[model samples]
Target: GEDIGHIKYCGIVDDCYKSKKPLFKIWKCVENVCVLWYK
Candidate 1:
């Protein structure tokens, strides 16, 4: 059970509505792009 509003856009789960409101925003440029989320 969940309300959409309480849901944080932190992952690729529902990528459509999911956003990059990461708890932490860290970026590094490399051969590939890596994204991660933690609670």
Candidate 2:
């Protein structure tokens, strides 16, 4: 069988925010899967 795992990328954007809250968060997975979540 082949290897299985995940890759991720993260950063912060000063101009990015919502509801007066800082939108500086992320969770990503690749290869096995890929996704994104910001807050």
Candidate 3:
């Protein structure tokens, strides 16, 4: 069986109006899994 889930994110780049950074930002990914999800 395979496990899957939805992901939600918030950051300065996504919502600059509310968040203050307003310059540069970082990114994160759902790393590591039972099997590699690479194509």
Candidate 4:
């Protein structure tokens, strides 16, 4: 906890890596940040 080691990284086209490769999973890039969506 000294270098702000906590941050969100963008996974390019990685929305469909789990369970499926093109369903339910959602991700968006805002402010150059990759925000992930889930159920």
What TM-score does each of the candidates earn?
0.18, 0.19, 0.15, 0.30
**lDDT per residue as tens, model 4, 1-39:** 234333345445454233445655456544444545734
Q: Write the per-residue lDDT of candidate 3 for residues 1-39, one digit (tens) a residue.
A: 544733333222344233356444333233332221244
Error of 1 at 15 (Å): 12
Which ranges of candidate 1 are over 4 A from the true structure?
1-18, 27-29, 35-39
Q: Candidate 4 clashing pairs?
A: none
Which residue window of length 10 is worst by lDDT in model 3? 28-37
Arrange candidates by lDDT, highest first: which order?
4, 2, 1, 3
Tens-digit per-residue lDDT, 1-39, candidate 2: 534434323223322222345455443442233334634
Give candidate 1's whole-model lDDT.
0.36
Q: State each model's CA lDDT, in order.
A: 0.36, 0.36, 0.34, 0.47
Best by TM-score: 4
- Candidate 4 regions exceeding 4 Å error are 1-21
Model 2 scores what on Cα lDDT?
0.36
Worst 10 residues of 1 by lDDT: 27-36
Minimum summed lDDT over a 10-residue window in model 2 is located at 8-17
lDDT of 1 by residue, 1-39 (tens): 433443333434333233457444443222233333333
CA RMSD of each candidate after superposition? 10.4, 9.3, 9.6, 5.7
* Global local distance difference test of model 3: 0.34
